[PDB]
């Protein structure tokens, strides 16, 4: 029952300013923090050898797209390696991002690990020596971070243990980040895997988010200095019932309204396995939902911003301009979507 200030007024202001800059009107996040194994699968899909130079070139391709993306991208999440790479002009990628008005983010978790006694459930690791890592990353240009927890909907999942443990680990990661001036993006992703419907996803999302925010409170987290990266509320991938975008928006906004304190600066949605267009249409629908939304509702898209770009590139440097063009189109689309001003360009029976 006694207050022991985790942060000073000055530290809070810094975190708040950073959080607000990332989700400023019309702006979203480019998630380019694919792991070594993940990015390997990406390059592999386009028959491109997974070498460091190809990874650097691809990242540069996205990070150096023309200024049209500037008003669209408030932040860019990078993986360790990329944080220390440079563009062809010798500038460190973090510098490249800031020059274009973006805030630099860094993924700090170390992947999921199995939880014994559960039905294939996991928690996430990466807390060891995280404080020292954040301090270094801060020095090297990063102002925010990312930590991904994964929950699954099934007969007995997510279990009480899985919900409590992931929420607690997110709170720990968030606490350490704020101590080093880094805005933590809390990501309690509930996978769309399974045949559950919209209602089940909404129910689970509500339970997970309530646990997350109680844990953040127990750990003295400064919400104004955080961002939430949740799954949109949707039916399971195997669900036979097809819902409207208005329904997905309503279910998503309702779940957030019942669990996310207004103090949270912004919600940067993940798109899971949604197509580029689908991710934009739903985000747009979410922003046009008639309910009161006290936080910015924008994006933190990886595949939803890169899919066509990676395809246009194909590994050929001659396709650089074409590839970046695909990326820009999606940034603009999603920039309009987070403002609710996006309109995409009998056999259905």
């Amino acid at each position: 029952p006694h207050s022991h200030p985790a942060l000073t007024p000055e530290q809070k202001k810094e975190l708040s300013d950073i959080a607000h800059r990332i989700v400023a009107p019309g702006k979203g996040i480019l998630a380019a923090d694919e792991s070594t194994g993940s990015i390997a699968k990406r390059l592999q899909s386009i028959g491109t050898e997974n070498t460091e130079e190809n990874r650097r070139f691809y990242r540069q391709l996205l990070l150096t797209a023309d200024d049209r993306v500037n008003p669209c991208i408030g932040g860019v999440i990078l993986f360790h390696e990329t944080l220390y790479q440079k563009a062809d002009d010798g500038r460190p990628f973090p510098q490249v991002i800031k020059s274009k008005g973006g805030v630099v983010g860094i993924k700090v978790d170390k992947g999921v690990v199995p939880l014994a006694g559960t039905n294939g459930e996991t928690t996430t690791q990466g807390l060891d020596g995280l404080s020292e890592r954040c301090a270094q990353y801060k020095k090297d240009g990063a102002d925010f971070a990312k930590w991904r927890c994964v929950l699954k909907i099934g007969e007995h999942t997510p279990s009480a243990l899985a919900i409590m443990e992931n929420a607690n680990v997110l709170a720990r990661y968030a606490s350490i980040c704020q101590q080093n001036g880094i805005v933590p993006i809390v990501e309690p992703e509930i996978l769309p895997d399974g045949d559950h419907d919209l209602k089940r996803c909404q129910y689970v999302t509500e339970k997970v988010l309530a646990a997350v925010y109680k844990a953040l409170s127990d750990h003295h987290i400064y919400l104004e200095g955080t961002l939430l990266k949740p799954n949109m509320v949707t039916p399971g991938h195997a669900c036979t019932q097809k819902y409207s975008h208005e329904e997905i928006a309503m279910a998503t906004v309702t779940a957030l309204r019942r669990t996310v304190p207004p103090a949270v600066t912004g919600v940067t949605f993940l798109s899971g396995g949604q197509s580029e267009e689908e991710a934009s249409i739903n985000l747009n629908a979410i922003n046009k939902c008639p309910l009161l939304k006290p936080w910015a509702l924008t994006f933190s898209y990886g595949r939803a911003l890169q899919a066509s770009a990676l395809k246009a590139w194909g590994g050929k440097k001659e396709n650089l301009k074409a590839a970046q063009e695909e990326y820009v189109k999606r940034a603009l689309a999603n920039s309009l979507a987070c403002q609710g001003k996006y309109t995409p360009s009998n056999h259905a029976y």
């Binding site: 993940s38 699968k41 990406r42 990886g302």
Partner: peptide, 4 residues
């Protein structure tokens, strides 16, 4: 993975 966050793509698929």
């Amino acid at each position: 993975d966050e793509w698929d």
